[PDB]
Symmetry: D2
């Protein structure tokens, strides 16, 4: 079908991209970066996240594939030496699709903005103390004081979430995971401490206590939001679809990245 | 239907148990501790775990309810002052049932024993260094050296799992969670560090490296197993059923036990 | 001798301050906020840190005392109801002095600025990834990637340091403690993980890898530093002196703040 | 002077030991394993700990040296290829000595036993729940419930202590460090969480609450102690002395073992 290729933009990735486009030229395949059905990302996980956000409006019409020009990625999990075999199998089609859960972030003001994250969304203070009330399904759960909070998708769990002590979750689980950044706990201040894992349909809302300005991140994007009344998290109805050409199990990808490769 | 009541065995719990049996005497309800359809446990979570293991062969024919004579429990989540209202509503029936996932542990030797856990199963060494190979769905994932490992159900996540840094998981998620106890990590030895969350149908197998004797726990029961060839973990096909009489959400129960009550 | 009193500036603290000044009026004591020998801080630990930084140039000529108008402080460890007894004993003098270690931070550019911290100094990135080389006594120890680093004095250990997993250290130990904020560790990136405790005379230097802009904090003060070549940490030669009027051991103060009071 | 050599007992270590004894035969050096002044340990850190405990009664008359036949050790920090140069320099003498702090453990019953640890002493329960009262300098600090507690020397901090989240402390600091093993913290149970670092002269006492049987370890030795009334920890007056032949800084040894070598 229609396809496009994004590149990290270094010499290696651009050449690999030109070679695949030449290869695709020998099949019924049209290059179209407006309405692709296949999006190939050549670079690291940073490049793959950008590809995801470039096409987040057509997630259900796109299958993603990632090629790693440097080290193994979690999203960019094919090697370059296999580009030609990838060209071949993508051209024929008939490939299986694999779907991972995504996170919906809603920011309400005194309008409303919604974002989709593939890894995570984080909340930190503008320039002072961070204090927020955490409300779960309309029930007040804790008053959080500390550096910030992180809400991760399952495939996000190997990223920022892991650095904050979160658990690694297989991406077939439709869930989101909330971790703390440097929480204060003394006689007067009290948080759960532990990461929290939420199923689909649960809503976690962060509400300002004093300061209403916050730094909010979604994957790579970080934006100062002013006059915030609420930040809301829930597992998205939308999913990201990967074109699958061979078996590469999530736990093997974890082993290869963290234990040994 | 037929019901029974277990007691922690202190003065408070026994009296409460005698009072409920007297109350049940005013309805069509037969006391039968052989084939009950309702099992009321009066005591702490320790008492409730024993009630679960007393009837683990008839899980699909029993609905459990727990009354806490001391502090709030996660399983024993009704107060004693409400015993009479509980008598009433249990007698009529028509109550809703709530189901939580369980963990299947299989121990293989050079026969085979299987256990069901409501909280967790743990593995530690007999008397020396603990070294085991962790294999996930037949893929070698890590060689673990340290004090031990813990595999938790979702309702188990607030117990031993929490103490070991694991995440708290809503019990509607069909999953198990593996946490490390004091893992060694240096130049030569390497584990994932992070807790790992597994969906239904994934199989985690622990295999001996040198010593084949291990201390294996399942909830309260701890047994030295000799001549072990494998310990296997998977989400059970079986579930524990709770009689539900009012709303008491899992996250509110977490708040009440860990943040404030 | 000469004394001054700083206030949190709320109604309670100002009144208490006016009452102590009236009380001091009945002894040979002169109010002088230029060259005091006694500095009384009335408020929380935030107020006490400001008092410390107001007089950091005359540390060896000043004995500090803190009164807590709200909850117990670590520095502001006297109750208000005891103000009059404090007036009395401070007036006579002959009190013992207690000394705690401080941290020296040196920031070098392409000039040089030095700061003194009572709690800690932290380093975070301006707006992008944080990557720094950590050099200990001229030996390259690790390349750190993550959110930031924190260097704590012993009395600082109960503050930000504690939130980041650091150990609590008795303040009679002349040392500083380095903790990580959200370090990345995978196949390619590698940090020690654990907090590190350094004795007097050891020098820890942070050196930029790519970006040379950093957010540097010292206690309450947070400043964006541009064109940084090095951040250097060492236990200061200077100490903060407390006027001691009764026994209140550090570990009891830890118990009272974190376990129960 | 008089010297002896202990071996791990594998083929490599025994041969290396025979070669050094032959080499020492060309100098004024007498082999004496009763009253040596130099103790050479050839093997891992396990072998070196045994050498330490073999001669713990003559610590002030002995200088230790460790050769690693396998991977780098923290105590056994010389390579085998340098045995001959070690022979040479040890024979002449005039070498500098380096001293590390040790931990004194006292166990009181309803007599009294004292032990010296080079790494750590740990306390765990015999077979049930572990509950102990932690008393610091006669002040009740916390009631600890969980798996156990670990008290580490500074050179011990890179061992068991590190696995439990403790800080790594330079061995020139005369201190001991207490870490928790799987502490329970809920509404009803409360521990400090954080590792605690104690200076010389502070006394930490563990006192039984219910069960008075405990598994107590000191380095490699693990013993079930019955009828325990108290376990007492303090920095020892005794020190272990190392023969120093070249510079190998503690932090470089940490880097080489944990970051890269
Ligand atoms: C160093 S900043 C983030 C690092 O983690 C990588 N990363 C990005 N997303 C993920 C993910 N989902 N899982 C693991 N690593 C990730 C990035 O490629 C980079 O190496
Ligand atoms: C792939 S580049 C963007 C990703 O970097 C990852 N990241 C940012 N900061 C950290 C950190 N301190 N540790 C691990 N990953 C991080 C976040 O998961 C983000 O989605
Ligand atoms: C102190 S040993 C275990 C403690 O945790 C409690 N407990 C048992 N099971 C659970 C659970 N599933 N979640 C939280 N606490 C539990 C027990 O009642 C006891 O307080
Ligand atoms: C309710 S009594 C049995 C439970 O005690 C809990 N338990 C045992 N040891 C610990 C611990 N160190 N921390 C928290 N819970 C524990 C385990 O989850 C077990 O199922
Ligand atoms: C909530 S931001 C910092 C919190 O920790 C307190 N704090 C400041 N310094 C210290 C310290 N050295 N030890 C413990 N708490 C501190 C402050 O008073 C406030 O409660
Ligand atoms: C007393 S107000 C200033 C202090 O707040 C403390 N602080 C800032 N952020 C945090 C945090 N996330 N956790 C604990 N303490 C903090 C730092 O130790 C600082 O010195
Ligand atoms: C695997 S059991 C202990 C492991 O830690 C090593 N070890 C023993 N003592 C120390 C120490 N003081 N610091 C670091 N590692 C140690 C042992 O040699 C072994 O590799
Ligand atoms: C060198 S062999 C003895 C040492 O093994 C180390 N050890 C035992 N168990 C562990 C563990 N789980 N993690 C790290 N080190 C350990 C302890 O520090 C002990 O002194």
């Amino acid at each position: 079908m229609k396809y496009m290729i994004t590149s990290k933009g270094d010499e290696k990735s651009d050449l690999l991209r030109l070679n695949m486009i030449a290869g695709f030229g020998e099949y019924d395949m049209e290059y179209d970066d407006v309405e692709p059905e296949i999006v190939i990302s050549i670079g690291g996980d940073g490049t793959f996240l950008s590809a995801f956000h470039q096409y987040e409006e057509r997630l259900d019409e796109i299958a993603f594939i990632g090629i790693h020009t440097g080290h193994l990625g979690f999203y960019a999990d094919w090697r370059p030496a296999e580009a030609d075999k990838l060209v071949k199998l993508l051209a024929k089609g008939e490939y299986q699709k694999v779907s991972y859960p995504l996170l919906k972030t809603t920011v309400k003001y005194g309008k409303e903005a919604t974002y989709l994250a593939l890894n995570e969304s984080t909340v930190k203070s503008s320039g002072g103390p961070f204090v927020v009330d955490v409300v779960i399904n309309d029930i007040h759960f804790e008053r959080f004081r500390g550096d910030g909070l992180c809400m991760s998708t399952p495939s996000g769990t190997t990223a920022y979430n892991k650095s904050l002590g979160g658990a690694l979750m297989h991406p077939s689980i439709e869930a989101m995971q909330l971790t703390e950044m440097a929480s204060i706990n003394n006689r007067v201040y009290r948080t759960i401490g532990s990461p929290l894992v939420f199923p689909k349909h649960h809503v976690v809302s962060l509400q300002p206590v004093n300061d209403k300005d916050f730094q909010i991140s979604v994957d790579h994007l970080s934006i100062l939001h002013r006059d915030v009344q609420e930040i809301r998290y829930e597992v998205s109805a939308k999913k990201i679809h990967f074109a699958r050409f061979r078996s590469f199990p999530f736990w093997r990808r974890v082993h290869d990245s963290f234990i040994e490769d």
